Amino acid sequence: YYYSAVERNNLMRLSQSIPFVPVPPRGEPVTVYRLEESSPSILNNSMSSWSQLGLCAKIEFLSKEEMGRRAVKVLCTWSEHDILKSGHLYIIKSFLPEVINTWKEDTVLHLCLREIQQQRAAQKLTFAFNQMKPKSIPYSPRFLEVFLLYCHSAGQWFAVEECMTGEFRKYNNNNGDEIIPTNTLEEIMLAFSHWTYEYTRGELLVLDLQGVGENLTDPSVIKAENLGEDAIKNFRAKHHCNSCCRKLKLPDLKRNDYT
Amino acid sequence: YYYSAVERNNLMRLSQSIPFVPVPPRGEPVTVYRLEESSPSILNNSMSSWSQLGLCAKIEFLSKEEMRRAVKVLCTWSEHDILKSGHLYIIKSFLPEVINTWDTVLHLCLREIQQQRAAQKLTFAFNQMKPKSIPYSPRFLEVFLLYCHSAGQWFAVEECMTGEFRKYNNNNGDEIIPTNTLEEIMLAFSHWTYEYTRGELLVLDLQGVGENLTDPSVIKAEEDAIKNFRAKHHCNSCCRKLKLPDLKRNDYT
Ligand SMILES: [Zn+2]
Numbered sequence: 074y075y076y077s078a079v080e081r082n083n084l085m086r087l088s089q090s091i092p093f094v095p096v097p098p099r100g101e102p103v104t105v106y107r108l109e110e111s112s113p114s115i116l117n118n119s120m121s122s123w124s125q126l127g128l129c130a131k132i133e134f135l136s137k138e139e140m141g142r143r144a145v146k147v148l149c150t151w152s153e154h155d156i157l158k159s160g161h162l163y164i165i166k167s168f169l170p171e172v173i174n175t176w177k178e179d180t181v182l183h184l185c186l187r188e189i190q191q192q193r194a195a196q197k198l199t200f201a202f203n204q205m206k207p208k209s210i211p212y213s214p215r216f217l218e219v220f221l222l223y224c225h226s227a228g229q230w231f232a233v234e235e236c237m238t239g240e241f242r243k244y245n246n247n248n249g250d251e252i253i254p255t256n257t258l259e260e261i262m263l264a265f266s267h268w269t270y271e272y273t274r275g276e277l278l279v280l281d282l283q284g285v286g287e288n289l290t291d292p293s294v295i296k297a298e299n300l301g302e303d304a305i306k307n308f309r310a311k312h313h314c315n316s317c318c319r320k321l322k323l324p325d326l327k328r329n330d331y332t
Numbered sequence: 333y334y335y336s337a338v339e340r341n342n343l344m345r346l347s348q349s350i351p352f353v354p355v356p357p358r359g360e361p362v363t364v365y366r367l368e369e370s371s372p373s374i375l376n377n378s379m380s381s382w383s384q385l386g387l388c389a390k391i392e393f394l395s396k397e398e399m400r401r402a403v404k405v406l407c408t409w410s411e412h413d414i415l416k417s418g419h420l421y422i423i424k425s426f427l428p429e430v431i432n433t434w435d436t437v438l439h440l441c442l443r444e445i446q447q448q449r450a451a452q453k454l455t456f457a458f459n460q461m462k463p464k465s466i467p468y469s470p471r472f473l474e475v476f477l478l479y480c481h482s483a484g485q486w487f488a489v490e491e492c493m494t495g496e497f498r499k500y501n502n503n504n505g506d507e508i509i510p511t512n513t514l515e516e517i518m519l520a521f522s523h524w525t526y527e528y529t530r531g532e533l534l535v536l537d538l539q540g541v542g543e544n545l546t547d548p549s550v551i552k553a554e555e556d557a558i559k560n561f562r563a564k565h566h567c568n569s570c571c572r573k574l575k576l577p578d579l580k581r582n583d584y585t
Pocket residue numbers: 264267312313314315318323
């Protein structure tokens with residue numbers, strides 16, 4: 074008994090240098106931080122603490138288009154521990170160097186942590202809203218998680234979000250101006266903003282509801298204490314309640330806060 | 333209905349300058365390539381071909397000792413899980429003197445991994461034709477080629493073996509005196525590869541933990557080191573169980 078020709082052959086092969094042609098670096102090196110939640114199981118009731126240890130990841134810089142504080146579309150090749158979806162499309166957002174000069178120094182980084190936080194605030198409301206809303210209401214609005222990202226080559230901080238593709242429309246804006254809903258999906262969205270104002274007892278109001286269907290993005294959270302006093306008012310003058318505001322049993326907006 | 337103080341607070345603090353301190357990503361990310369097989373499930377009758385794609389894997393350095401100079405490391409994450417995550421792996425580089433004797437370090441590597449696989453293949457065959465009498469089944473680990481970005485260089489990666497490590501023979505016919513079965517089989521296998529390969533090859537430097545070996549030395553006859561083993565190897569009861577002719581004989585009778 075000895076080694077077949079097949080065997081003898083494969084072994085002799087190894088003895089000599091076999092070819093080695095490594096495909097080149099398909100992508101750009103990046104590190105990403107996330108806003109961690111105490112108990113995510115119950116979003117609304119949870120403390121938001123930033124992460125200290127950044128995950129290494131890689132993203133291929135797809136387009137040369139900066140749509141706008143613009144944003145770029147990039148592809149996530151690999152993500153450490155799979156924070157980002159290794160194999161899906163993300164949006165990289167950032168602000169203008171001028172809207173930055175309008176400050177607080179080293180602005181860029183902060184600005185991003187704030188936007189990611191503002192969005193998390195919306196998410197908490199959303200979670201709370203969907204958590205205690207009559208089973209009559211079919212659609213549940215939702216915001217995707219936003220991550221802090223740090224580019225090395227470009228050397229700058231960005232906010233990253235799961236990029237969605239589909240029918241994108243604006244349900245209302247930080248001016249108080251809203252659209253006249255048609256489908257029920259449209260109604261719920263518009264009622265939600267009204268809701269946040271009630272729930273938070275006039276403390277906050279989520280505006281700029283936009284996105285594709287149920288999945289929302291780039292909202293705008295407003296505090297009563299411009300956008301603070303103004304937007305909160307226009308919205309109350311402008312807003313037109315609907316089927317949901319009824320079903321949610323929410324008091325009219327345009328009325329006296331002393332009765 | 334309204335909202336509690338918990339949420340009121342969490343929600344409000346989210347609107348407040350929460351603190352952010354960037355710790356430097358721990359450990360370094362590297363690129364690993366492997367020696368693939370056209371039929372992994374039959375190492376002996378399968379062709380080996382290097383891969384072109386280098387999947388990323390993050391590792392954490394632990395040790396720094398030079399026991400070819402090696403180093404202990406822990407895989408924390410690997411793309412498409414090329415490296416078992418949360419597993420210790422060893423990274424060996426080449427002795428400074430051993431390297432300055434031929435871009436070469438990269439080749440010095442692709443060769444040693446190529447080498448171990450041949451041994452790996454030979455073991456698959458051995459374990460295949462092995463009688464029921466020989467229970468222990470020698471095994472070689474799979475080695476990978478990786479590229480450190482920081483240290484800017486290439487190295488080999490093998491899983492860390494736990495347990496008492498010992499060497500049964502070396503590339504010089506120097507072999508231990510079997511104190512138990514295992515050792516007999518380990519000494520035999522070497523003899524058996526020379527028989528199986530028809531004197532073409534000899535696997536020496538049999539070392540590792542238990543039946544799990546590593547870092548072998550494979551000799552090709554042209555054949556001087558092959559001389560020693562022929563003179564020095566003493567057949568044990570195993571060589572017999574495998575019917576391995578007496579190495580010290582005539583090649584033309
Ligand atoms: Zn309403």
